[PDB]
Design an enzyme around this catalytic site. Sequence first.
Site, PDB file in Angstrom:
ATOM      1  N   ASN A 149       8.162   7.758   1.503  1.00 42.42           N
ATOM      2  CA  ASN A 149       6.981   8.360   2.099  1.00 42.42           C
ATOM      3  C   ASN A 149       7.379   9.319   3.205  1.00 42.42           C
ATOM      4  OD1 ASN A 149       4.743   7.256   0.612  1.00 42.42           O
ATOM      5  ND2 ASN A 149       5.018   5.319   1.752  1.00 42.42           N
ATOM      6  N   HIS A 202      -1.000   6.476  -5.357  1.00 44.20           N
ATOM      7  CA  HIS A 202      -0.349   7.772  -5.402  1.00 44.20           C
ATOM      8  C   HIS A 202      -0.751   8.567  -6.646  1.00 44.20           C
ATOM      9  CE1 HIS A 202       2.647   7.312  -2.025  1.00 44.20           C
ATOM     10  NE2 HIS A 202       2.458   6.025  -2.272  1.00 44.20           N
TER      11      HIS A 202
END
Lengths: 501, 505, 500, 502
Positions: B141, B68
Amino acid sequence: GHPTNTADVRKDRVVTNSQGAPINEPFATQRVGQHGPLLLQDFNLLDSLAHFNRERIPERNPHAHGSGAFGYLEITDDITDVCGSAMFDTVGKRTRCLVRFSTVGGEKGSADTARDPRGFAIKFYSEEGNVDWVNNNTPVFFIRDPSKFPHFIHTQKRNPETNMKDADMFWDFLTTEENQVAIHQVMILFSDRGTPASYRNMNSYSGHTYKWSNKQGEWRYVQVHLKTDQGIKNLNNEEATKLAGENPDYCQKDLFENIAKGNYPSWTLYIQTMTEEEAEKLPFSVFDLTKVWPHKQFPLRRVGKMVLNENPENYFAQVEQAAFSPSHTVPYQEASADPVLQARLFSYPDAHRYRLGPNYSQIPVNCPYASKVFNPAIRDGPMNVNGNLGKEPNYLSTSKKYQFIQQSKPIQQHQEVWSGPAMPVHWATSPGDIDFVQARDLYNKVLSKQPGQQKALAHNVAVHVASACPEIQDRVFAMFARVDRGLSENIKKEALSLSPR
Amino acid sequence: FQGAMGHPTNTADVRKDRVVTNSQGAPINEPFATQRVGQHGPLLLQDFNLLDSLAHFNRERIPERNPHAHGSGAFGYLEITDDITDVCGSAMFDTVGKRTRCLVRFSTVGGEKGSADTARDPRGFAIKFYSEEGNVDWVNNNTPVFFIRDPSKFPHFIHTQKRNPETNMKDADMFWDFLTTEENQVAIHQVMILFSDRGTPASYRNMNSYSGHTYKWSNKQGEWRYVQVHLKTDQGIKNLNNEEATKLAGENPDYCQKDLFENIAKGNYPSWTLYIQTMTEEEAEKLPFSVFDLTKVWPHKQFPLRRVGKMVLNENPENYFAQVEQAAFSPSHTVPYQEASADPVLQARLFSYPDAHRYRLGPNYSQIPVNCPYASKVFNPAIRDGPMNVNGNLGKEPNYLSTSKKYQFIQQSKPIQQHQEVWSGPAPVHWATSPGDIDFVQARDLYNKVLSKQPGQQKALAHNVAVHVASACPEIQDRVFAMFARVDRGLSENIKKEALSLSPR
Amino acid sequence: HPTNTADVRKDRVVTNSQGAPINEPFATQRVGQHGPLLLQDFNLLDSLAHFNRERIPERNPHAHGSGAFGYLEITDDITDVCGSAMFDTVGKRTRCLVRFSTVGGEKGSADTARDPRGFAIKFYSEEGNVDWVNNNTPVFFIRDPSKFPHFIHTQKRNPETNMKDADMFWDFLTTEENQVAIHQVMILFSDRGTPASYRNMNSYSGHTYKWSNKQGEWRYVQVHLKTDQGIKNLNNEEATKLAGENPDYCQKDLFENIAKGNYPSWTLYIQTMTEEEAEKLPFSVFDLTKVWPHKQFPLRRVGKMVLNENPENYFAQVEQAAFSPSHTVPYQEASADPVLQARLFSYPDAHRYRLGPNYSQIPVNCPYASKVFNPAIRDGPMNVNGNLGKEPNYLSTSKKYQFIQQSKPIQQHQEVWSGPAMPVHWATSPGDIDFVQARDLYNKVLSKQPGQQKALAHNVAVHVASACPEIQDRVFAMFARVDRGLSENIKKEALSLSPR
Amino acid sequence: GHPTNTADVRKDRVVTNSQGAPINEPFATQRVGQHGPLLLQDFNLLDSLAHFNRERIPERNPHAHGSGAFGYLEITDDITDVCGSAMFDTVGKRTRCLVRFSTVGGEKGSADTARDPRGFAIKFYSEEGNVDWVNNNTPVFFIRDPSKFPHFIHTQKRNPETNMKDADMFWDFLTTEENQVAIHQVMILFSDRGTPASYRNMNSYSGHTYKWSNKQGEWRYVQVHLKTDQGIKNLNNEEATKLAGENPDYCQKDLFENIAKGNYPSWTLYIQTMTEEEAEKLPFSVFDLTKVWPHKQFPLRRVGKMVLNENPENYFAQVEQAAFSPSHTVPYQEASADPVLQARLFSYPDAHRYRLGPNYSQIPVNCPYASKVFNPAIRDGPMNVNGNLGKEPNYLSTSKKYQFIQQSKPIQQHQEVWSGPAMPVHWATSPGDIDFVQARDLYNKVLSKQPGQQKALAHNVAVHVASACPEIQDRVFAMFARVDRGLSENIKKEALSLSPRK
Ligand SMILES: [Cl-]
Ligand SMILES: [Cl-]
Ligand SMILES: [K+]
Ligand SMILES: [K+]
Ligand SMILES: [K+]
Ligand SMILES: [K+]
């Protein structure tokens, strides 16, 4: 494999944890019963997860994105009249080398085909130490004041509020009148050599003047030129943009695959030399990074051939952890008083100590394997992995022997004699035309010999500056008009069509 | 008179007089002059201002997040619109109409810092709430499931989504080699979602956020429930297709960052509606799958969504690095009455994230303003010292529980988890793909009951896979074809025909 | 004060590092009453992991020390010499922080070890933080900066045995090229090598500095801070006994005297000299191993420094304090003393390693009276002050930037240098020039202090008695160049303790 | 030399900089002319100075101060019935080992002869991996709740305001009622064994119970005892204080010099074992670190002998950088549910990664040279110096071969069956006398056999607590009175003479 480029893998293929204890199931984790919460005592899980959290180190600033290969330099001509370094002392002598190619502005995951100068840094593993030639693919650069380097780089990167590239700050800095000495490199950047077709199709230049001395104590100002034996080849702006989306690793793939199949790229090494007398008669300064030495007056002299013929076994271990610095040099090779070069002598080892750690010279790829390190007073530090010289004293003990060689070889005391007070100097753009004439010569005497290159330069600027606000656009137009009025009008017309007012 | 202050989590301090100084407050009398002997002699060591500037420049960068690394952020609030105190006793819910400030960081997963906003990927959608009971992070997510249900597979899985350790390039072979290995095929549900058009959202404003895991929420009477969180975009789902995503990767790699920032800057604040699903312990024992299994969803018909509130993002960060890059989220950052379940992936995350923060940012990262719990200040006598301690280190406060001082421990009668499940057994389990169809059926239901209702989405799924697997060698390709056939024969045939046309034999 | 305070919840509610309340101080989660521990106990791992990170690298050197806050008050007009704001008004007070220290000992070694003492002072002025990074002696052991790592190593532990080592200690100092250290060695082995407390010692710039006035004239300057409590020293046996019985003897003394109101003070003086006077001297103003004799260069009073505030938190204010000779203000510049020149580089570099790149954002190090504003200095780990928000990170032509004192020279109004780039090793001079001031200390200073000449010999003898006989002989020979009797006194005592 | 303890020094003795270029004058530095200002271009000077600034790493927290030596363990008895680890599988078998001795509370420059427990940590380099026995010189400890460790260690160190040791906080924490289970280790600390005469003259104990299994799947709770072959020898309070001043490095010197002259110190290794049935019947818990197993019911069984015979070549490289953890173990050795031990399994690797770096297991002294590490998924990280497995895939590629041995050997699933909810527990001092009785047995059954020891303990406490305020002193007198009233009267009498009251 070579110690700079190898590994050691258990031949029995038994998988272990970081302490050598065998793992009896690759993925089972301990919990209470079949589906209870996880137990703290699962060392193998925490070992793996904790190392995963530490895989990354800080990216280079700048030149974060890049590629590398191993090779050698072969000496084909005798230049011992200029330079006494061992790597030159015998025709036919081979020195192993490591090269890292890079872009400048882009972060680690950016695209190979961005418009940018490319780095072309070379580490030579010689018998007198590791010498690094930390070069770009251009013979000039944007600045001749080192204090401007952080500012320039900031404006080539992301806006601190929006986190996006910003044409306004890009060109605001370049058109500030004190900074317009960058115009020579800007012309080069927005020519099609700003988007090379591959690292095999570009040159390497010292950029700065260095000073090289012979074993008799005579010396010269020197410029280094590495010309590709594959030929210059460029992308145009649209080919570069399309590849960026479709293959951000285009140049890495080209380099790796051509080496892997035996199509080893090569370069021919030349130098320019100049006497102290010649240097004072110049209409510019040999210390000025934004200036080149004209070939007709200072012809190239051949030295040897560099070949890249070996891919890295592990990108992180050998490329990401590679450390180059211009202050890594050998006897008989020295830096000149180019103030940008002077500042790099400090900046790079300081960066390495933060990015890689204080004992980064013990990383194999950075080890001077042909001239082992022996300094009694350089000891300890985190991750000292080579024994720390054992029980050797940490000072110059009179019970021991120490050899200091080349005691009679001067460093720089045989070269220029300086005079003056300690003086702060801002080497702002000079008045008159001196800081523009080499930009005009590039346009009128070089790009004109290349069909369609004068137009491609205009197009490449126009599409970039078209994002800037109007007053900045106008400053950009005025600056290029100093080079060539027609070039300025071509940029203006295209730019204005893309951004009407 | 004094002016309006920006929020403490998102502000700065800039001299009104604009006097430029060095890092020690002494003024610089020329921005760029450097000391040398004479006009053009070599540079002098005694130029502190030059070395100050250059050494700090050398230290601007910190290690990127793994994974990420690439992302965007904005501040906003969550407003409670319904009373859910029967489910959860947390302060952030205790009053209808009450707002809690929040920070959201959106991200991709695989790409490095300078990779494309529009790459195909799950998107991170992490939320930090600054509540009166502490900062609670919902590290979510934009999908309700994930690729693994064994936490030990995470480093392996992440490696195969990134670059080959020799060539430094993405590698379709290792991508699919890992996902089609028999013990790992429980990933198929998430793979279907990844390879649908939702794998390339049109902007962060047009995607959802999901807890993914089951959590446990308790009320003030000691009752508890399994909970799933769903944040649905009020702007609607909107997606790019594969070719649009690729072309934008080249022309504007910061496309989503630009969209978020510019829409906020002009007042078009995006919002989401917050819902939960709840389940009792009795219901969970009756399910054909596990509430601890991250690869499963709870069907809406049996577990309807219940509205809770509205989240609005209305404030851009003042400094990307200070507030987005240094932001630190963890699922183990929680508040009273919200706890994690025994989902083994979630359990590992409780450990992983604080450990990553301490390496990436420093041991005292909770003192960075964006990470500070400004509505519930830290007071722990035994948490002291450490590098870059900037908040005074509690001054002369004893560093233990001295009998001469008063210390208040509130909520002593509130259980943590001892009121919930009863565990039994000895202390290692590899939760490999189950036999039969249980780990393939929800992927089939997505294909046949959901995507079938979206014109062109079944075709686009096969296309998105085909173009990706076409780069893999034939043996891997055939394993991919076979795995998808477990979902649906026709999806498989479509992938195969196109892939082979792209890489004929 | 902002440099010395904290914020503690008034309700005394105990929480974890994210502000969530802890409902039991010590309970830890496990299966059942006595099963194994669960990974999901965030509160335990939170505490245990921060405990693992409490320590930062100790200073190298000067690891062991003590600190206090105070102020300097100007009592005399010296604006003819120096135009700095901190001097510009009689009666003006500037806040300061002082860190006292030993040199060679590690963290936790004894306060009463024989050593020079550090006496570093940070001033929080309106023109920035200026540090006077001083020792309690006007000289030092070296005048080549390259010898510092070597010297410090021989003062510390042997790399094989990890013990202090008289052989390497004296091997280095008696090496001919290094014997310019003899002046400081005399001082170190006098009883002033073991002060009775930090309140009973002086502070000296050691180096020459350059101070300029607002009219552009400048002078070479030496700074002297003389204790108003008087010099008081321990002898070797007292210092040894205290090392065992109270290794924190000096920290205890400083803290308790401030706490009870017996605030210690020092009187600030300077010596000044022009470039002409300096060119006539038989030694160099750039030589750290030399002093300026008081009769030819008398002291001039400037003001008074008082320490009246103990730190609230030792780690936060003392351990984390960063001093550097390169932290200076307008009208104060460093001289071409080659040791001082190298220190301008070394200290910022150590701070960035030891403390972190943004260490100047730590409150004690913050220039709270002249806040930092530099558009190009941004990001870095633990940037905690907002990083200037949306300010451009370059000199945007759309913004305003004020560069004050543009016509105030830095050093270009001072000396004119000439020559090539020359490697120079300033080895010990032939003849007596590097010994005469050491001899002046013994014959003209210590002779007037009853028993001090004997005490010096005794202090050397007990130390060198551990060295091998050849090193012993080199030490005796070196002191004999200063004085015959001194050498013989040392030799008698050393040989009685280690007969051959 | 051995790979864990050697170096490489240029035989030509040519002095170079950190990049291998020769230095042509040891100390000359570049300036303009002979006495002008220094030039930035002197790479050699900055190279030396900047590396000097980075010599130090953070000290251990705790056990910062210490000494180390190399040696071997020889197996002299067959215990394969108890434990199947390779290091035990053959009588006569030698495994190399590293030992680090330390104090607990003092910083790096503190005195060897301080009153403290001593660390006695052993790293064994075996064919199945490196296994560490991270022991103290006492069989018990101050706590049985791991959350109390930062608090306890803080009170043993410096006051956060004054930066001085502080007897009020020292004893405040130990007399807090929930913490008084510390009394057993406190009695040992203030006996004369709190100041050993040298590292060669003390024992080593696991302290915790561990669980050891044989190759047939049977297991036992185990305690490990390493007894000095040189004999116990102690200092008294006044000798230790005087030596702290005169030679703060007394024990390092003793170890180094005795090894250098051939007088190698040794220890005899024994174990206690106990079945699960026997542990059900004990009046205390095998998971309780403050309890010992009485010898009469659980006799010692001999295993082998440890010899230390090799000094480090470089203290920093082999001693300061050594990394020990109880979670570094080998097949057939596992930890118990002792909650203190459980927490240590996490703390030490986490500390190592901060203090030394993520790749600290590549530092030679910490490498498993007899069982090279091979893990495809453990890669990169700062200072990766071993080649990083080259082009090996960083996952389990189906194209490569990976061997997982001992697949049928359990880890812990063959041992205890746990039951209950996730329960937060504070294991405070128990009511009644169970947490005091073993401390009383020490005073009455052990110290009584050593002439003057009972009084020496009272004196050692008295001189320490005399610095404490009267409210705290009284709490201390009352706590020892729970152990023995005469002991308490003896402490009180001497302390009140050193600190009289109104
Ligand atoms: Cl860490
Ligand atoms: Cl650093
Ligand atoms: K050039
Ligand atoms: K789910
Ligand atoms: K001096
Ligand atoms: K025990």
